[model samples]
Target: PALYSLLFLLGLLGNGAVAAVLLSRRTALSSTDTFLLHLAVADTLLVLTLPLWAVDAAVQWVFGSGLCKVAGALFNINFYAGALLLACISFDRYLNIVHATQLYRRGPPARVTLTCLAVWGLCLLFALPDFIFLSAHHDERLNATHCQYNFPQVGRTALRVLQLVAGFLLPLLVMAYCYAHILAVLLVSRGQRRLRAMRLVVVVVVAFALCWTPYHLVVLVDILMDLGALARNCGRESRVDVAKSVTSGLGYMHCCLNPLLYAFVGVKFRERMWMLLLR
Candidate 1:
């Protein structure tokens, strides 16, 4: 609970500052900036829910069913959206820097706006099951009101896998591929400037993987165990749940880390931040 509370504070402040810096930039946003702006928005929304979740962790969920669904679904949507937007940012950087190829004949900003709309639309679609299935229920055995997803029948087995694919696997693949090629192209560069940017690209992708990969992998194993695809002993079940809880909080830490990587580390972002603060 204390850790979550700390995460909530840092995430809110970091994302808020990023959004402020970006918005204060007088120039029109580039495609990469557009994706980053939306990423901050998604992460900000994601972390806003954490305070409630933090409180709920210490005390049982006192927030009722409607809030449960709204909070849970919003949490899921923005979480997926942040990951998807990061992937989009990587691809955008790939297109702009790696290749001469233009994804849209119309060019940027407008094109990126359309692309972002699609990303948000798809993320919302992916989050629908959470909205539909999540409820705050009083567990008689535990005698506590807990908010959770209750996917029915095959869905219980399937949606966990679906979320893992949509949220982690696909984004990881896209970002890895895009950045790997970007790094390859940037390597052997004579210019220190390009090399510095390339290093940042590698750091961003690696840091994201470090934060999320463990959690997703653990969750995948848990899902498979629940499906009986893996033989699960009582000891294994306890371990998995403990791992899931620890790694789940670790996943939230990404929201806090992203601004440090994406905005605070950038010269332009840091300069713009100063302007925003001074004015």
Candidate 2:
């Protein structure tokens, strides 16, 4: 209960600052800057739904079925959007650093805008199932109304598979591939700037893996149990539920860390932040 509220505050302030600093810049935004801004927007939206979940955790889903669907859809939409934006950022960095290409240089504004729109479009498609299947219902066992996906068996399996593949696995692979190439490029070079760039690459990849991998692992187990591949006793079921909550909370913490990892660590962004502070 408290955890969600704390994450809400932290994510709001952090991503809000990122948006302010990025938007305040006088020069045209780079592709990476544009993606980071979108990421901040997505993370901000995701955290805005946390308070509802916090209240749900403390008591029950008092928000009714309509609001539950809206909140659930909003949460899933932004969650996937933020992850996809991180993948986009990684790919952009790979092009800029590893291939020495500037895809957005010709028509920076339009290209960046289109790229972000495409990401949001994909996210919305991914979240369509949530909008269709999620609702608030009173659980007989718990005697509390809960906001959750009420999918059929096949639909549940399909949704979980889609989430696992698109939301986590694909993004992790993209980040790993891009950062590995960037790390190699940095390794061949010799300079303080190159060293710092290498550090940033490592930190980005590590932070992402650390924050998301556990949650995905738990989700994988849940999927397996759902499929009857793993025998689940009452004790194990309860344990998995607790694990899911803890790991999802950890996943939520990633939004708070995104501004720090992606924006605050950047020299240009830091300069912009200082300028904003001075003014």
Candidate 3:
């Protein structure tokens, strides 16, 4: 409990700093910068909910139903928003490099800006159901109702499966297609394009894969387990818990590495940083 409390504080502090940076650093954020900004915000929000969870982990549902709903909503929003934004950023870069899709050139910057705005709004809508069905309820042994998912949560029959699909499946498809297109182009283009661009794009995909892949797999496995398609390690609770923790941790950490891949690696970002700081 103490450790989780520490993590909650530290995570909040770190993401708060990141949000400040995103807001203040005005050296041309570009079309994709909008996505990264939203990414950081999403990740920060995910971490912000940890305090509630940390407290809950120790004291159960001391907080009221309102907080539970908000945290539940935030949890869904954070994951879905972050994943959606990452997918958009990935496809944008892939198009810029491989397909030479030129939305940035053809339309005014407003079009791209509108797309970024739409992504966040749509992701929030998709995540709304997570809040709707989640609540505090008393278990047979427990005196107080705990703040958690109300099993057989209201929604369509496949609510949980749909959550998996929205949060993981569709985004995974988009990322796969984008990365495949990029690699194919990189292989064929050879020496024509800038290596820095190609390298940075690969790094983005790899970082996202390393961080998000396990979580997606775990969710898939959990669904299979629930559906009797596969068995759960009811005996290996400790190991399974560790695995779950690692993947969830990985998902939260996409923020820490994304700037390195997306922002700092950009030559323009460097030039602007130099001007913004040194000048």
Candidate 4:
């Protein structure tokens, strides 16, 4: 309960600040800046739904079935969107730094906008199952109403696998590939700026892996239990539940870290933010 509240407050403040600073910039935005803006928006939306889950965790699902569905879908839409946006940002950096592709830097801004639109569209499609199948259902054992997915066995398995692949595996692979190449390029180059850029790349990749890997590992275990590969006694079931909650809180903390890792680390972003503050 307290954990969720803290996450909500911090995530909202951090992402809100990032969005405000980005929006206040009068000059043309770079592709990375545009992606960061979208990412901040996605994180802000994702955390906005955290209060509902916090209440559900503390007591029960007081929210109705309609709100349950809306909250569930919104959470999922932004969750997936945020992850994909991080991947997009890494890929953009890869193109700009590694390949020396002036395309992202010099190309029309419309292309980046269209790419962000595509990300949102893909995330909405990914969240369709939640919109359709999530509901406020009473759990007899817990004796509490919970908002959760009500998918069929097959659908549940399929969606879990889809989420695992699309949300975690795909993004991890993209970031790893992009950052690895970028690191190599920077290693061969000789400059203080390149060294700083390399450090940022390393931190971004490491932070992402550290924040999300544990949660996904727990989710994989849950998938195994669902498939009957792991025998699920009540003891193990409850243990996994606790693990999921803890690890997912860690995962959500990544949203709060996003602005710091991607934006505040940049000298230009800090200058702009300070200027905005002074104004």
Best by TM-score: 4
lDDT of 3 by residue, 1-279 (tens): 565666666666655544555566644465676777677788777877766665674567777888788888888777778888878887887777776754446544433777777877887897777677677878774465576676563333276678777877788789889887887787777575547656766776777778877876776666666677766565544455467777866655565555556666666556655665564
Q: Per-residue lDDT for 1-279 in model 4, tens only? A: 676677778888999999999999776798889999999998888888777766776688886888877888898899988889999998988888877845444455545788889989988988887777788888888787888778787778888898899999999999999999999999999887987888888888889999999998998998999898999788998999899878877877887788889999999899989999999
Please write out the lDDT profile of model 2 over residues 37-156, one tens digit for every residue.
Answer: 999998988888877776786688887888977888898889889888999999988988887754435564545788788889888887787677788877886687788777787888
- Summed over model 4, clashes come to 0
- Whole-model lDDT per candidate: 0.82, 0.85, 0.69, 0.86
Colliding pairs, model 1: none
Q: List CA RMSD, all candidates.
A: 2.5, 2.1, 3.7, 1.8
lDDT of 2 at 264: 90
Q: TM-score each candidate.
A: 0.91, 0.93, 0.79, 0.94
Per-residue lDDT of 252 in model 2: 80
Alpha carbon lDDT of residue 66, candidate 4? 86
- lDDT order of candidates, top first: 4, 2, 1, 3
Clashing pairs in 2: none
The lDDT, on a scale of 0 to 1, for candidate 3 is 0.69
Q: Which residue pairs clash in candidate 3?
A: 137-145
Lowest lDDT sum, 10 consecutive residues, model 3, at: 102-111
Positional deviation of residue 141's Cα in model 2 after best superposition, in angstroms: 3.1
In terms of lDDT, the best-performing candidate is 4
Could you tell me which 10 consecutive residues in candidate 1 have the lowest summed lDDT?
Answer: 102-111
Error of 4 at 2 (Å): 4.4
Winner on lDDT (2 vs 4): 4
